[PDB]
Design a protein around this ligand. Sequence first.
Ligand SMILES: [Zn+2]
Lengths: 97, 135, 42, 246, 101, 194, 113, 149
Amino acid sequence: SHRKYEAPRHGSLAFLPRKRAARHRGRVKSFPKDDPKKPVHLTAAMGYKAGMTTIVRDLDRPGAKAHKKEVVEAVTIIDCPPMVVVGLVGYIETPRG
Amino acid sequence: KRGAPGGKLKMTLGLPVGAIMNCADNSGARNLYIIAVKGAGARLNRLPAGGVGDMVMATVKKGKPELRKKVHPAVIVRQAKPWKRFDGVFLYFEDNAGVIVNPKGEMKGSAITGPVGKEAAELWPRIASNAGVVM
Amino acid sequence: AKSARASRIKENHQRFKKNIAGPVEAARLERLSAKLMAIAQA
Amino acid sequence: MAVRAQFENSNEVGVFATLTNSYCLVALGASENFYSVFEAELQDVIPICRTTIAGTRIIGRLTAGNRKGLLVPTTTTDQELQHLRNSLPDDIRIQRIEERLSALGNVIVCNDHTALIHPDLERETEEIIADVLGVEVFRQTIADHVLVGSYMALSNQGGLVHPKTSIQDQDELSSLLGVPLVAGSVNRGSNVIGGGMVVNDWLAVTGLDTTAPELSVIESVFRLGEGAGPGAINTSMKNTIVESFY
Amino acid sequence: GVFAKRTMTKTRRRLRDLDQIERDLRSPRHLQQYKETKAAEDLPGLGLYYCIECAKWFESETSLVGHRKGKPHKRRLKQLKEGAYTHEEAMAAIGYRIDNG
Amino acid sequence: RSLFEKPVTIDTIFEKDEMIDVIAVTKGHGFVGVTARWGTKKLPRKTHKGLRKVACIGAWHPSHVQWTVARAGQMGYHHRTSVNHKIYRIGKGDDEANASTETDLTKKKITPMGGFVRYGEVNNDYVMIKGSVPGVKKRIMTLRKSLFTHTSRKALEKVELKWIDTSSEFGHGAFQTAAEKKQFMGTLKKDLQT
Amino acid sequence: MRIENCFFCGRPAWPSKGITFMRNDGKAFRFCRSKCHKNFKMKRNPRKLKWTKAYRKNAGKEMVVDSTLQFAARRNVPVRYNRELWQKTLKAMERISEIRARRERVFYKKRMA
Amino acid sequence: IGTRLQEVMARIHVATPMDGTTRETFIPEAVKNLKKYDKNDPNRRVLARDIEEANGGAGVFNVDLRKDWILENPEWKYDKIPEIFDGKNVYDYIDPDIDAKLQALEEEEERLEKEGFYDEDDEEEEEILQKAEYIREQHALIRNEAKMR
Ligand SMILES: [Zn+2]
């Protein structure tokens, strides 16, 4: 028989399986779509998460209640020493990807 | 128009259904027993809960006998559960209290004892005009 | 409510992307590419 | 010169505005309509400041003053105080006061010559009011209401009080203030006069729900427009008032 | 002995502060405010027997004269003689003052 | 080829007031039951054979456990790609006052008093990101450009910082600088002993 | 923004630090931390707790009568903004801090002779 | 007279002081020279609604709060006013007569240098402290031996 009271399911099936990641370093699954009319640029970077701290921000958000007021927000610090470029990979398009 | 006010930021709700608060006006009631919160959502087993500035439906458990048999809209003006404002300040009052109003927001009473919350005063201009301390 | 997959919401977002956010992103891209070109030519 | 206006579909003008004979204070909103009503009525004659008090928008009930001074409560921040000081000219003295009853617009009502206060203010606060505002200070109630600044609107021309004020109370209050007084309502029968309207010596701004008879009463008592006087109430507008408010 | 000592620090179990008791002793208007925030029919002894220093009601004059000889009342008297902590003393502890012109 | 053997700084790839995406592996929790892994309701007190459980896992056909039913297992250490994170500041390592704002003139660096807990000190360029990011301390993070043109006013907003907290996160730190701490404390016994 | 002070112990209260108790008479009490807040909820006396600036002021272990401590006050009368006034004020705060620190060291030596 | 009729008579009643005096008013002289605002007038005054509609409408246009600031020098209107300096409030130290107090503080400082308020000041004493420290160390060793045994 049917369930007497409706309730949404616990958790999202989009994030299955709930297993350990296959690599410690994160993977860019999708880079931004390339436009040849743009100037050349790099799409990504690395960093190391250092910690979190607190700021006070003077907010300019028209229509919001905290407009022209001070807001306290949590932020995260990422230490970013400059990367070193050491290589170049070429990719071709095939009917298998 | 239902009693849930617009332009309200998220805050910690401290008064679920079944809570008894003090009655902060001079309408003759001494306490308010929450039976419903305006604007509450639907979730299995979850008690509807309100915070400062919210309109609830309340009965009167002690006070004048003519107010004991009716359900009144009320606005929570003070709560004891700590909550955070956008300026980073966590704060709480020493009691839970509200005032009896009509659905349009005008109060039944003529005066408010004690301070009211900033959220309640900003959301209800009649409470802001009947408040002695905005706090 | 109109969903995130609604056609009218998609058209509103496309108009916003074309008319408002686009020039700002283009100018930021020009500045960043100029700086990284300066490094690559240095 | 009485104008109906709203602050985000709200008829409580005195909650969001403060009007004196030398400046105007308006709450900062998401649009410019409430500011522009006052701007259209006051074409740069007196400054209009879009200001915030203690992070709120209820500056009309949190601030009090006249053409000589301005009093802000103790929770006003230094940046809001600096913004008010930079917006107003040096002829106006601005002070932040340490009153326990911080709703200054509710506990104080004043004109350029005299002030009525909530009876429970502190003596040094009374001295600060008499010094900054340059007025005579009295402790009174408006028909057993201690929030005189919310239950009375006062100018140098006259005053409009709570509709349930007795005739003897009106007479003694008018004798104490030196101005003519009348009992009437705003916003279709609301008794919250100070919360419903703001007034100076030549302009009144009421809510949009203020009906035509009470608008005429307001114009007569505050002497707004050509040929306006409080003597029209009991001579020419008496039939209208009896037909409306019976 | 304290009744229900586990939750005596809860906000709903809060008692009156010493500076409020000093202002109640100094000004009858403040004490009148505090007494109109209560109902006289629910108070011990119909509210007629009240100790301001202990900020507490009693069922009878015999009970009030009784607790006056006890050490909690004498503790309250000694604390009031020492003087309660206030914001003025808090500012004077750090050397802070108010400039009103 | 021109970029070979060269250092690329973070501010030449990303810019202040830009939303980016952060890609990282989340905090590991080990083997975790259904109550914390999936957020299921607890069974009543002293329920037989456990209460931090799901009462019925297969109460209907088929004669199988379905893949959509909550089970105990590994929680955390998952790959995540979180989007639309605003960059509030790109601070330079050589700048001795990269935690100073226009209204806070205290010359100080981003590192809290006593250092970041379980990290150390930030002596290089740093990125300030609004909110939280999927990783933990010491973890490598990938910052990526947003795949699409933004649709929010928040992405076009300009961030104006007034103050940055630099007090100790090893406790209830009330001082931003050691000079402020010594000014509040005064003269100590070891100050005369030294 | 500004820097408050803890009601209980007098330590500097920066934004998003501690908690504020709002009393029904109209008084706000700002505490820098849960230690001070819980001592207040237990109704302990800061003048008697030896780790507080109130106790140190009562015991005379803080320099209280000094000309350098008369420069900081809660200004209830605002001043119109003037760039040179703010810059000379900043220079004044720096010099006052140096003078106050060295006078405090002299005070401590006179205590510990 | 009924209660409702008494209320409407109280509404129509106008109270005046018995002395007959009036308060002297403060309407400025530009009010009579003001021209009444008309929506249909092409030469009407441009309002903040008009500026907001031209620059994006409500929720998009960002108002400039420093535009109406009255300062001594008009290029100070868009300054970043300092608030925090080395753990102190700048607004706590803002005082219009700061130069006189600073000079008084300085004159007091060279005065205190003149009568030497900040000046700073035996082998037998050092030897007796070293001997006492050695004796205390011996006492600690004896106590540790006793606690061991
Ligand atoms: Zn503290």
